[PDB]
């Protein structure tokens, strides 16, 4: 996985230095290496919903679209992360509220 | 192009909030005595632009800030008593 990435970014640098995706992600515009390499390279190894790592990697890359199973195995992780946000968000500013109380004076 | 020379203003005071407290009280006295209070009057007075043009800038706060950076004004922590600073203010056309 690491070599596809570090050589998707080799390509862009050496020919296509002004590629949108590249230029954006090299400046501070948007994007980042893991994102890019999910678009152009390979999405890589996937974790099951129980910690274990699926020993068949998502070989595909959005551009060349991933597939049913490739899609499904790489969905468990999407949720035990999208819940992470929603469980952090729902607690309004619980920590800031604790903090404001000890300190305000 | 934010506020009329705002960095030069902070420099006058010991604490940020002083500038805030003064700019208030000066606008406060400025407001009451229909602008007949000015220390900058002549052609320094702040102005607007319209469908006509060049009419006095209504914002008292603005005035205090320009008035303050001519040095002319004097602010203090405790010199001059309030109970006698209120009455003596009615000297050249009051409220």
């Amino acid at each position: 996985t690491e070599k596809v990435t570090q050589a998707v970014f080799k390509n862009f640098e050496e020919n296509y230095p002004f590629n949108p995706l590249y230029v954006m992600a090299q400046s501070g515009a948007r994007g980042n290496p893991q994102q890019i390499r999910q678009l152009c390279g390979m999405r890589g190894l996937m974790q099951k919903p129980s910690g274990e790592t699926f020993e068949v990697p998502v070989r595909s890359s959005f551009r060349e679209g991933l597939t049913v199973l490739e899609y499904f195995i790489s969905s468990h992780g999407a949720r035990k992360g999208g819940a992470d946000t929603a469980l952090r968000t729902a607690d309004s500013g619980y920590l800031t509220r604790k903090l404001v109380d000890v300190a305000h004076e | 192009m934010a506020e009329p020379g705002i960095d030069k203003l902070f420099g006058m005071v010991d604490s940020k909030y002083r500038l805030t407290v003064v700019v208030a009280k000066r606008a406060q006295q400025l407001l009451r005595h229909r602008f007949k209070n000015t220390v900058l009057e002549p052609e320094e007075r702040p102005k607007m632009r319209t469908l006509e043009g060049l009419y006095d800038d209504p914002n008292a706060v603005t005035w205090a800030m320009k008035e303050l950076l001519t040095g002319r004004l004097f602010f203090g922590e405790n010199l001059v008593p309030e109970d006698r600073l209120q009455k003596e203010m009615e000297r050249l056309y009051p409220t």
Partner: protein
Amino acid sequence: TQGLPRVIELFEARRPKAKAVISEIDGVVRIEEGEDRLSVFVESEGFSKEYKLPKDARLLVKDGDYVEAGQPLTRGAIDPHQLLEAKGPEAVERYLVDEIQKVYRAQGVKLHDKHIEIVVRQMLKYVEVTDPGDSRLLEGQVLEKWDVEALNERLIAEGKVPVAWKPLLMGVTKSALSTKSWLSAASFQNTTHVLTEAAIAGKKDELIGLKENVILGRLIPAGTGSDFVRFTQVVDQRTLKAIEEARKE
């Protein structure tokens, strides 16, 4: 534990998950029996401490190691309660800060130490009594409420006692409730009791902090509302020579 649970765990200042063992005294190391039950000894001539470890214990000291009092022995979290009473309040302070920033740092945030420093200062704000001066010897009192009753009952009106105290590790929320201010103590769940206890005793507020003042809708004691600034008056030049013409009549 890591992430946001850990940040709470520190502020709330609780016996953490994975209570990594710390040597009570300094001496030498003597790990023994890796099979039945596993235990690390700390020993010098004189003292000899025996710490029994879960086995699953990820200790990282090899045998015959030299060691320092209060230094971790088993890896994982330090119970900042065990630390306080075994290395100091100052020493505890520097641990907490260093450890919270650790999370924020490793996730990716940058924010000043002096921020966390301020809160940790409050987590220590309190002290318990040993041998009192004009109260009962069990009370939990604010550190600089019993500072005027320490090196002032010795600076002028000397006598009785300077009052002996011990530091206490209040956990942020618990350091919240125990405030001099009935006004703010009220907002909290049990309001009767505050108002009960407080009324029985003369209890004046003083309205030191913010919450208090807001409760009564008074003008916040900070910024434009800080005594240090709020009293500033402003006068004009022509107006100032209307005081030279009127203060000697």
